[PDB]
Design a binder for this molecule. Structure first.
Ligand SMILES: [Zn+2]
Length: 494
């Protein structure tokens, strides 16, 4: 037809954990619909922002479906996930569009649906058919499945950890889609599963991913590679077809197989390089005790950014027991503690076990807690990571005992930014160490005001596969000693 071309756009952001017993609920989501989806995209720096800004700079009209963002955590309540998909499907019916370009995480998880993105693509194709193009921007932590490869025209992921190319990945999803406009066929896809999980040393600026990322850039610079991505799968999913994935696209007779071979072999060779020795909590708290600079401690074992619950009071425990007088603040998921605190009121002292209700691996911390402040854990992230984005971890109580402050929260405490501490009235200057529930994504946000050390704590996000009852994920390395060699799936062979 003759009319301006339009692109259907939308977003889902959620990362799951098969071993977090706390379901992600409707409350945990921010939803936008209609034009508001596009207004937010233009004012932000997500992959969706990239998709929408690029589509509009290129002359396309963008048509909204919805956007749905919830912090990482347990599987989404199935009904809520079903309602999200239905809103996508309905937008796919009601609207006029010539192609679809979406910002999805790739490791969203629902209580019954294990491959959520794959499922979403199928439901959309039920309504839109197999001719129109669908392009995805994905997080590199995606659980990338054969169904996804089969149901999408093209897929591209982040290339940095910590994730600093989020928007650019969106730009590229849309640019790739636009580039395919005159093609008489979809591009050929080569999928390769390398059956191991990473256990740290997984940043892209140094370590094994720097070499592998360099090789990847050279492959993509060839005129006979359309694109390629490397997925370091989120390592807390009990799902089949599990491991690292290399995904490459060409015109049917380019280098997608060679690229995928080279990179799969490098990842395999490097499988035991993805390990680290994090500093102990005792050593880190002793640096804090002897430093003028604030310490910001990444609680590796209980990261909400790794879809953990954030109920570990462990760092508070060690501070209390081994460093009396050391001023440490820790954010802890404990909705009951909040409610107990709210009933006692500000200024009361209550004997109470805080934290540890959800992570089997750490004990609740029981003390005479004084309730210094009741307030809402609502604030704006300074960033860089998620700069400008508003957060709300629910009703909160700031609790003290000896020199330790525990801020208990009603919703998952995705603390990766200094604004949290200021918003709940625990000023950073007042502490010698504070806790971030992230390993990599808090560092830039605290770089200017703290020494950042990620510490070797226990819990549901420790890089210890042997601690989890993986069932349908197995076999994978390190748990199983498997004899892998390159064996790709090919899709849209020409
Ligand atoms: Zn990620």
């Amino acid at each position: 037809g003759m009319a301006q071309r339009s692109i259907l756009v939308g977003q889902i952001w959620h990362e799951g954990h098969s071993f977090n017993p706390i379901l992600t609920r409707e409350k945990d989501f921010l939803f936008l619909r209609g034009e508001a989806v596009l207004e937010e995209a233009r004012a932000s720096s997500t992959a969706l922002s990239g998709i929408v800004k690029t589509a509009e700079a290129l002359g396309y009209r963008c048509v909204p479906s919805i956007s749905a963002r919830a912090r990482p955590g347990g599987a989404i309540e199935q009904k809520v996930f079903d309602n999200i998909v239905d809103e996508f499907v309905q937008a796919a019916r009601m609207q006029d569009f010539d192609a679809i370009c979406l910002d999805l995480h790739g490791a969203t998880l629902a209580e019954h649906t294990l491959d959520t993105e794959g499922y979403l693509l199928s439901r959309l194709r039920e309504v839109v058919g197999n001719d129109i193009m669908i392009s995805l921007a994905l997080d590199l932590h995606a659980y990338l499945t054969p169904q996804m490869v089969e149901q999408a025209t093209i897929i591209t992921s982040f290339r940095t950890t910590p994730h600093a190319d989020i928007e650019e990945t969106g730009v590229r999803a849309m640019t790739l889609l636009d580039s395919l406009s005159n093609e008489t066929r979809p591009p050929r896809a080569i999928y390769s599963l390398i059956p191991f999980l990473t256990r740290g040393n997984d940043e892209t600026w140094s370590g094994p991913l720097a070499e592998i990322g360099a090789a990847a850039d050279r492959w993509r610079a060839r005129s006979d590679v359309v694109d390629l991505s490397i997925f370091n799968v989120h390592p807390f999913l009990d799902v089949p077809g599990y491991g690292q994935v290399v995904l490459a696209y060409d015109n049917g007779s380019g280098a997608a197989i060679d690229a995928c071979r080279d990179l799969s072999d490098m990842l395999w060779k490097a499988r035991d390089e993805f390990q680290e020795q994090l500093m102990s909590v005792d050593k880190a708290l002793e640096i804090a005790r002897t430093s003028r600079q604030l310490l910001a401690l990444g609680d590796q074992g209980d990261r909400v950014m790794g879809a953990g619950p954030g109920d570990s009071p462990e760092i508070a425990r060690v501070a209390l027991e081994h460093f009396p007088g050391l001023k440490v603040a820790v954010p802890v998921y404990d909705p009951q503690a909040v409610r107990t605190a709210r009933e006692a009121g500000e200024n009361a002292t209550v004997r109470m076990a805080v934290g540890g209700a959800f992570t089997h691996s750490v004990a609740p911390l029981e003390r005479d807690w004084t309730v210094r402040k009741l307030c809402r854990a609502r604030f704006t992230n300074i960033g860089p990571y998620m700069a400008g984005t508003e957060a709300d971890f629910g009703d909160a109580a700031v609790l003290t005992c000896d020199a330790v402050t525990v801020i208990v929260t009603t919703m998952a405490p995705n603390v990766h930014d200094p604004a949290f501490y200021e918003a709940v009235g625990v000023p950073l200057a007042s502490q010698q160490a504070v806790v971030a529930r992230a390993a990599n994504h808090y560092k830039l946000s605290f770089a200017d005001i703290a020494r950042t050390i990620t510490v070797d704590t226990p819990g549901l996000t420790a890089f210890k596969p042997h601690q989890f009852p993986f069932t349908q994920a197995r076999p994978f390395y390190p748990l199983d000693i498997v004899q892998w060699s390159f064996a790709p799936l090919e899709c849209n062979k020409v």
